[model samples]
Target: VVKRTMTKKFLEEAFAGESMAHMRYLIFAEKAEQEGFPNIAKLFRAIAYAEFVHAKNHFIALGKLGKTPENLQMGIEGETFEVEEMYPVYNKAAEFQGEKEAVRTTHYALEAEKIHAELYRKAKEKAEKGEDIEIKKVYICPICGYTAVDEAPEYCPVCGAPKEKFVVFE
Candidate 1:
């Protein structure tokens, strides 16, 4: 295992925070646009772009980026661990404590990460063969954290959220 210095650990956390901020800003920007504040929306998007840059820089500095196959394996491992270990413990604890909201949220993450790991495994296979995984679009159900590639269901199977609530990323 690589020994992490304070700077590396800090960069790791900063990268995660910056990545979340980037996505949050995009959501805010979309809301602003929907509310007839195009200029404000643009500003939010601009800052979100900057946040992405910061995330990318931090990730690079951490030496986390590797060859395509290694990156795919890394994703597979990370998503699998979240599904198999991390969220399972959190969700079980929430259930035992009767924290309904926490249980629901962690269950959502648990299910979603399973799908992510499966996708990552497929991607790894394609990467190993020097072929790209083919997907046209991705639809994410914001309410329950369900994800669909190329097509979304009429309703989110996990959360019963309507398909209209999903956001498309293509």
Candidate 2:
């Protein structure tokens, strides 16, 4: 397939976006570690590099476009949709159209989101306790940096990680 050159603006945005993702995944990995999910943390750290490569791809695109690659890291905007966008898929899984992974992925992602909700609550509690509930970092998949929200999969749909790989986000 013919690949198009990445524009200067696009390259900068993409690089920054992926770089941010890398750092966040590390934070997520650390959270998993705190939660005694080292294996999960390892998996997330693995995907953290993928985000780096993704950022590199944008740089390559810049090269193709004959741009000087001015460390243009301001890549894309937020994900096109929320994790809950899979509600239909989860519904299908629950209704028998999808497999166990589908249902579990949805549920687990949802559970993660719930955990985030709890994290917020706890943060509030911390604040009330005269301590800012300082979150160490946000959680992301090592396999794919796929942050769990609501129902995370037992295995990553993109990277095939056990559901245990997901870390809780605050």
Candidate 3:
């Protein structure tokens, strides 16, 4: 057998990990800002941007950044799988193992992913019609990953995070 190394899978994982790190550091930066650590927050933001560069390179290498409709479809599939398959198994296992934190995290992920799938579906519809997704602002609940389009709710239905705490990603 000829030795072969598959880059698609590795690149996909790298892309995913780098994207996650980027978001994680962005959140860390937000906390640092709230805690009055301006320099630390700036540093975190700088590193987050570097992580994003890595993620973008991996994404380009994976050849997975399809057109708008294709991207929305991919998002829908990924979110649906997380909600329908991955988180259920994770949540069940955590509950079975009596891991409270794991259970909480899984529950949060499952609920948020359901909304994510719906959002992607809506975006897919718009893309299919050759229309842009109409939104004034996208609000995200930092604590539970709950997302809202246009307006933030008084409380995050998924995690009860206050609307004030939601970040605007406009």
Candidate 4:
């Protein structure tokens, strides 16, 4: 029975730190592999996994784990935030500064997050009824993170990636 105290704040900070470290290491690993240092890439990946475990432990200790419906709600909230708040401001800033790449990336994220929020909302409704969402196949565009259910589009609306470039999840 841990109360919300300084320890809880510490746990949250640690969780965030470890989570960022995990992602950073994984990205670094991919760069290492591309540079032909497979051993270093492996080391980075192994350490990244350890960081993920640390983050998971911290998150569990903070009692952040929830049922499917609750988890879906969280996902919905996050995606909605990106769609309605974060990316709008970011894209505006990038456009104002004439940063083409930044504007492009933010535009891509905002578009994809709109669909992500809708998908999460639909999934949440099903989860609340104690049923899983009917997902036959999930397709994602690797370039811009555009997601599709059941089938890939002929071209990704966000990035213009061809259907063959979509990754399918079953």
lDDT of 1 by residue, 60-134 (tens): 888888999999899999998998889999999999999999999999988899999998898889899989889
What's model 4's overall lDDT? 0.92
Task: Provide the lDDT at 94 for model 2.
Answer: 78
Q: Residue-wise lDDT of candidate 3 within 96-159, one digit each (tens)?
A: 9999999999998898899999999988898999899888898988898888899677999988
Q: Rate the local accuracy (lDDT) of all candidates.
A: 0.91, 0.61, 0.89, 0.92
Name the lDDT of candidate 2. Answer: 0.61
Where is the poorest 10-residue window by lDDT in model 4?
Answer: 1-10
For every model in order, what is the number of clashing pairs? Answer: 0, 27, 0, 0
lDDT of 2 by residue, 115-145 (tens): 4444444444555455644445554676445
Error of 2 at 110 (Å): 40
What TM-scores do the predictions have? 0.82, 0.33, 0.84, 0.91
The runs of at least 3 residues in candidate 4 whose Cα sits more than 4 Å from the true structure, single-residue gaps closed, are 1-4
State the lDDT at 87 in candidate 2. Answer: 54
lDDT of 4 at 167: 90
What TM-score would you give candidate 3 relative to the actual structure? 0.84
Where model 1 places Cα greater than 4 Å from the true spot, the runs are: 1-4, 30-36
Best-to-worst order by TM-score is: 4, 3, 1, 2
